[PDB]
Design a protein around this ligand. Structure first.
Ligand SMILES: [Cl-]
Length: 197
């Protein structure tokens, strides 16, 4: 129940990155994938006998919506003078029925994911901006546990689905601060580890 959902959520947070220029490093990948959400980890291939990575890496995000946006955007983009391949891990299958269940459950909500939120922007002023598409039920930015500094992303929940669709359409890649917002619909319901019979 709650255990197999956690297993799929963990796979949903990871994105495969292939065709990485041999001279490119972990920081180049970090800067490139950080706009979609804060990076939890970068697992990179290493050929001990040949030196330098084996052209691919696994970027792990904190939330599955970040991985979905980094997949939609970022695939085929040029990095270091080589077009990268962005996909999902090979074992994403035989986990897919739960990924599809989480997607069905997400459709019951009018929740959107927002990344690349400028550090100086707060909760209420992000709420005021996105309130242009309709009445907002909740608007919350993710915070750092130590300092109350937000992590550059959050979730907005709308009363109507039209508002939700309008917001993603009109606000993805919007110039708010020096940063371009990355906005997508949620791919999970709020708190996916619930399964309430
Ligand atoms: Cl501006």
């Amino acid at each position: 129940g709650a255990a197999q959902r956690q297993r799929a959520l963990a796979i949903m947070c990871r994105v495969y990155v292939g065709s990485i220029y041999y001279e490119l490093g972990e920081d180049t990948i970090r800067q490139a994938f950080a706009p979609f959400g804060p990076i939890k980890s970068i697992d990179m291939s290493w050929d001990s006998v040949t030196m330098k990575h084996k052209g691919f890496a696994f970027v792990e995000y904190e939330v599955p919506e970040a991985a979905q946006l980094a997949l939609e955007q970022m695939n085929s983009v040029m990095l270091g003078g080589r077009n990268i391949k962005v996909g999902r891990p090979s074992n994403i299958g035989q986990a897919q029925p739960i990924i599809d269940q989480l997607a069905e459950e997400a459709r019951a909500f009018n929740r959107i994911y927002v990344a690349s939120v400028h550090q100086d922007l707060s909760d209420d002023d992000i709420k005021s901006v996105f309130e242009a598409f309709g009445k907002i039920k909740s608007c919350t930015l993710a915070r750092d546990p130590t300092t109350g500094k937000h992590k550059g992303y959050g979730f907005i929940e709308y009363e109507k689905a039209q508002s939700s669709q309008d917001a993603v359409s009109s606000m993805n890649l919007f110039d708010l601060g020096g940063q371009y917002l990355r906005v997508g619909k949620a791919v999970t319901p709020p708190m996916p580890l619930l399964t309430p019979a």
